[PDB]
Symmetry: C2
Subunit: 129 residues, 2 copies
Amino acid sequence: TIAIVIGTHGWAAEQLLKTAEMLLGEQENVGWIDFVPGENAETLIEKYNAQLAKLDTTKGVLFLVDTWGGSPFNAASRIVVDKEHYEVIAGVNIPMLVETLMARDDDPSFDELVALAVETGREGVKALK
Amino acid sequence: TIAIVIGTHGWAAEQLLKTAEMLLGEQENVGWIDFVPGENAETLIEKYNAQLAKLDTTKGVLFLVDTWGGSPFNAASRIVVDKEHYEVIAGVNIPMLVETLMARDDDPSFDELVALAVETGREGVKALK
């Protein structure tokens, strides 16, 4: 399947994945990194690369990060720059993760998965009242 | 300020808060709960109530939860039902948390804060390419 790597400031990426797996069962072909004060984008690029080495990236790689413009985002941006089937999507949330992981198994095309992740992430933000 | 309570399946709520505080500094008047397999909505209602007892809820309470329809959402829904200035917003993400926590200090009205949280949460989901 298409590889997914989750990155956030701090230690939330591992928990967002755990939450998803609580809903969907354990997932394959998913990696994550943490970002600690003192580290820079170059440290993060290495962390992302070490995770990618363990993933099947033949169909592509989708980096799901916390916010636009942070270090996790900046480092991921440097990796996907001239790579086909590599994308970075900011604002990762549970609806995005769950929908994306579910669709991934039905072997969608890369563009299809990227579009679904953005759409479900946004539609997942909704107030009760 | 307006109280914020974060709830997700699993143990991600505490980390989303930690991530936010890594960006903004430690926050006051914020609570969180976890949801473990075996627990039901009634357990969660008690957990939310115990957190609220420690918060200043005079200006209102905003429950930020992971997904629409899950237990964390269902329990929060039962609490806000006929309460003024109580709202539940699903799809919590870092952009929503950061913008919401920042605005909260400028003492916005409840409706203003709810609207900002939904708008920033959605606008925060964005693809690079």
